[PDB]
Design a protein around this ligand. Structure first.
Ligand SMILES: CCCCCCCCCCCCC(=O)N[C@@H](CO)C[C@@H](O)c1ccccc1
Length: 236
């Protein structure tokens, strides 16, 4: 890349690829808090200074869409308001490359506390597969950065995030005279979110909100990708 965040991007993508994909099923520091269909949501309970930082990991498997498609929809700001429900306002502060932008946004008061905002680089990348036996990996990383055109606000508490949507497409081609269809593909999703609320809120409540809001998002977002791609040629 050309832009000034290229090194930080790679580090984030590499850290997600080595640590965020790690298996969490039989990890005793992780608790399965939500299950529904192919969807599972785990959390690790962590606090620093009485502030709840609980890392969150969700895994999902969505029939009929590719990882490329799910990442595309996740990243594309032009469709954000079609699925995202926790945001008051947002805008793009800077475009760094074709695949990388910085975004400022304010969240609805889902917490018993002052309104939060967040300012983050949002980048979409493909990680090539080592062999053709393996899926390519598409990832969108959303992580907090600073920018001059969005200094600390005086009304909102500035949250800090490290988030990734990581997707791999499994294909199961049919045996006969038929071409691959969407009935023959399945997107495996790992979604990780590490959010620093930027100040105190009662923990019991933050965990309630996380338990409620992440699975809601993943269902509506994934369903929306299924809707928008249905009947359309497959983008691997
Ligand atoms: C900082 C105040 C956020 C309040 C918590 C709301 C739970 C969010 C569930 C859905 C996240 C969808 C989600 O990942 N949204 C992205 C597009 O808006 C930005 C994002 O990567 C982010 C993740 C977590 C918190 C804030 C932004």
């Amino acid at each position: 890349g050309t832009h000034r965040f290229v090194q930080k991007v790679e580090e984030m993508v590499q850290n997600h690829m080595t640590y965020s994909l790690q298996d969490v099923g039989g990890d005793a520091n992780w608790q399965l808090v939500v299950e529904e269909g192919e969807m599972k949501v785990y959390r690790r309970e962590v606090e620093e200074n009485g502030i709840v930082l609980d890392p969150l990991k969700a895994t999902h498997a969505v029939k009929g869409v590719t990882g490329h498609e799910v990442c595309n929809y996740f990243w594309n700001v032009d469709v954000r308001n079609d699925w995202e429900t926790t945001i008051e306002n947002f805008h793009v502060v800077e475009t760094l490359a074709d695949n990388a932008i910085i975004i400022y946004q304010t969240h609805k008061r889902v917490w018993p506390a002052s309104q939060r905002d967040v300012l983050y680089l949002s980048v979409i990348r493909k990680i090539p597969a080592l062999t053709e036996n393996d899926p390519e990996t598409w990832i969108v990383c959303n992580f907090s950065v600073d920018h001059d055109s969005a200094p600390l606000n005086n009304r909102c508490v500035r949250a800090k995030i490290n988030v990734a949507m990581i997707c791999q497409t499994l294909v199961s081609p049919p045996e006969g005279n038929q071409e691959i269809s969407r009935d023959n593909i399945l997107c495996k999703i790992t979604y990780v979110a590490n959010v620093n609320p930027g100040g105190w809120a009662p923990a019991s409540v933050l965990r309630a909100v996380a338990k409620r809001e992440y699975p809601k998002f993943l269902k509506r977002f994934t369903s929306y990708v299924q809707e928008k791609t249905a009947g359309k040629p497959i983008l691997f």
